[PDB]
Write a protein that binds this ligand. Sequence first.
Ligand code: HEM
Ligand code: HEM
Ligand SMILES: Nc1ccc2ccc(CCNCCc3cccc(F)c3)cc2n1
Ligand SMILES: Nc1ccc2ccc(CCNCCc3cccc(F)c3)cc2n1
Ligand SMILES: C[C@H](O)[C@H](O)[C@H]1CNc2nc(N)[nH]c(=O)c2N1
Ligand SMILES: C[C@H](O)[C@H](O)[C@H]1CNc2nc(N)[nH]c(=O)c2N1
Ligand SMILES: [Cl-]
Ligand SMILES: [Cl-]
Lengths: 362, 362
Amino acid sequence: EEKEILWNEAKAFIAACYQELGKAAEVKDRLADIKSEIDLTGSYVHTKEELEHGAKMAWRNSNRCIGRLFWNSLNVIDRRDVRTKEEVRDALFHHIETATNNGKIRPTITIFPPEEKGEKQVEIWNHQLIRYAGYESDGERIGDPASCSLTAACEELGWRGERTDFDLLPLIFRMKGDEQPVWYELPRSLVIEVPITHPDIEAFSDLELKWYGVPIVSDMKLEVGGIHYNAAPFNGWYMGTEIGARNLADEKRYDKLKKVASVIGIAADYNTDLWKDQALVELNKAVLHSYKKQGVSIVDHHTAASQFKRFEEQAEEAGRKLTGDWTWLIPPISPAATHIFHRSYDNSIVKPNYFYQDKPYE
Amino acid sequence: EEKEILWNEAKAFIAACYQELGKAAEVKDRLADIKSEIDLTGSYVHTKEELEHGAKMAWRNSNRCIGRLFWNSLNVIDRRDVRTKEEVRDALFHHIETATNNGKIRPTITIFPPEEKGEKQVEIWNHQLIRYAGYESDGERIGDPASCSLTAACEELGWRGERTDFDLLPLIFRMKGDEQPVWYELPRSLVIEVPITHPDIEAFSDLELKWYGVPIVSDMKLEVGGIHYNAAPFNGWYMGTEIGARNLADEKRYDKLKKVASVIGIAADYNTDLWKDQALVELNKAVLHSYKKQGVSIVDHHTAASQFKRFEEQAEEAGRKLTGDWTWLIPPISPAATHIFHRSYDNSIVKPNYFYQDKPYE
Ligand code: HEM
Ligand code: HEM
Ligand SMILES: Nc1ccc2ccc(CCNCCc3cccc(F)c3)cc2n1
Ligand SMILES: Nc1ccc2ccc(CCNCCc3cccc(F)c3)cc2n1
Ligand SMILES: C[C@H](O)[C@H](O)[C@H]1CNc2nc(N)[nH]c(=O)c2N1
Ligand SMILES: C[C@H](O)[C@H](O)[C@H]1CNc2nc(N)[nH]c(=O)c2N1
Ligand SMILES: [Cl-]
Ligand SMILES: [Cl-]
């Protein structure tokens, strides 16, 4: 009954995958051995080629992603061989190192063993491999409020943060058979951070802002041909707005706009002065400038939008239907200055794809 | 068969309308005389009260409108008595004068005779009562490109613009029975315009930018209880972004960002400089400052969003379901700085409401 669902997703995936790979004739045979493997074993195993391409397709089908133009150059690391938590840790450590690449970020995914009977083999608790802790007790707010629950969960497990605004959370994941996850402190040598400075305004450094170089989302499920890789951390490079317009700007995050307004020497008293808008722009100029000055890869929303237009064109030229989430594709600053704002997108879900899954904590 | 459709929309409207007006007991009687009027005559006539409230409800149900908090103070002018084109013109002239109110803009609607058998009594060709002409021939682009087709249509009818970037289009409308519309030049004395200057940057005036004080949309159909008022021009005051972020900024409109960047003394060479974003902010600061300095009503997107939050609260407190179009409610600058961005809205269409209708020209 579940062999059914698996079989249909499998048929659809192999057909599309081998078609794209120019291996159309191999399909019929490949489906046979798959159908056989399903009957006897309950599931099937992807070849390295299928898995590599599947992850790339998944990125291509991510409606909310503006950076999809480079779907085909995704660096896929196959770690389905891991069995121990030391291996998982070392693989996670390695992902960080190779994705970072001294600042020349390589879009990478590391793929761990998939679910068996819906039973996880590895269960990553981090939202990103690199993320700042968040604390809130009596009156006191420290760090990233988005990290409050995971931070408290880590501190249940014997970890303790220094309670700076930028404590690096430890890696935290659970192996099948264990009741509790384990946690490992990150080697500082592996984690690139960027101090935020401004090209014109020397006072901007007084804010003592910084962010991490590489966003590595690690709580999403990669689905490929009926196979559920619940643990498959992936990364790209940042679009500046993600940091300057949200992470540092949102009132429910770091909430820096009033402070930005002060150091750039404008008043924050009247809405009609548009001080938030002005602060947002200077803060976002600062983020791009800082990353570029350090030699850490990053893209601005305009260039990113230009690239996404190429992606649209490429999709059409290749005879592929385009899907997208307009509400997530438009950047949070000057969205009407991008072509994205002025057209609409079909928000249909196509597989392979990346999905949300329930948090183990909370 | 059409008496049916009319009757159902009527029943629904009267029930809701008299409920809101505290006149619940009058409903049963009101429905009787309505049902009778439908049978014999094919339609029915709204009382001044019903019509006034209906227009207010329509504004309340406008999913795309951020300014809905003040739905209940809409100034409704009942011009269902008009029969001649001189009367229509004078009513349109009067709408402009009273809505403008020396700069202290009053949200107003003027309601003309509704459709009979789907047959229009009056047919307004203008998109707004006050709008700038647009021209494009060989290489030459002049004025508002959004006005190109209507401008060419007016020039078919014997009108001629001076071909400045800000030619006021004449009022153009057609009376039932006439094959062609008529056109009337606007008295300059009735039209307030605002020159765009900047609070800090004196050079900003070199751009010679200006806009009109009052946006009076005149091509939408007001629908109330099955009755189709195809000609019912309405106005509010401007949100600054409408002018500074779209009308003057869009590449397919006035396309001023590169020029703004120059007069404010920044380079327009690199995307990572965010010069468009910076230009957008200074241009939008200029628009708000200029309108306020002239004493012409206007709102910024933050204040407008604050007001719309009150509208949400008011809707809930009154037991009314809220409907909205997220893609139109978010402002085109700093949308993530408003609460609108961070929640979702139900985009259901509720009547009474304002609708698009086909252009008579093109
Ligand atoms: C190469 C540079 C990349 C850039 C600049 C980029 C840009 C973005 C941005 C700005 C978002 C919106 C995130 C937010 O609003 O929080 C996004 C969403 C997303 N991106 Fe990308 N991306 C890149 C690479 C990738 C890669 C390598 C993958 C995976 C293979 C990926 C998959 C996604 C997914 C799944 C989402 C949506 C996540 C969610 O719904 O929460 N992207 N991308
Ligand atoms: C009082 C001040 C008002 C403000 C600041 C305001 C603000 C806005 C804004 C910014 C838009 C988006 C327009 C665009 O993106 O092109 C909008 C749409 C709209 N507003 Fe309002 N509005 C106001 C009053 C009114 C009034 C009096 C009515 C009618 C009774 C109205 C009905 C609408 C409608 C129907 C739309 C959508 C039109 C369309 O879909 O093209 N608004 N409003
Ligand atoms: N630059 C990139 C590259 C790949 C990405 C892949 C996924 C995402 C989504 C990250 N945000 C998800 C929503 C979320 C979840 C948890 C906390 C938050 F603040 C926000 C962002 C990306 N950014
Ligand atoms: N400030 C206000 C008040 C009421 C409004 C009522 C309606 C509208 C919609 C105006 N724009 C409609 C879309 C459109 C149509 C035609 C040309 C364009 F450039 C744009 C704007 C309003 N702005
Ligand atoms: C496709 C998209 O809905 C369309 O381009 C919208 C986007 N949001 C908008 N929002 C406003 N206020 N005005 C507009 O004209 C548009 N255009
Ligand atoms: C309701 C709405 O879809 C939600 O708040 C979205 C809006 N668009 C977004 N766009 C991006 N890129 N990231 C987000 O977190 C959100 N939040
Ligand atoms: Cl992030
Ligand atoms: Cl307008």
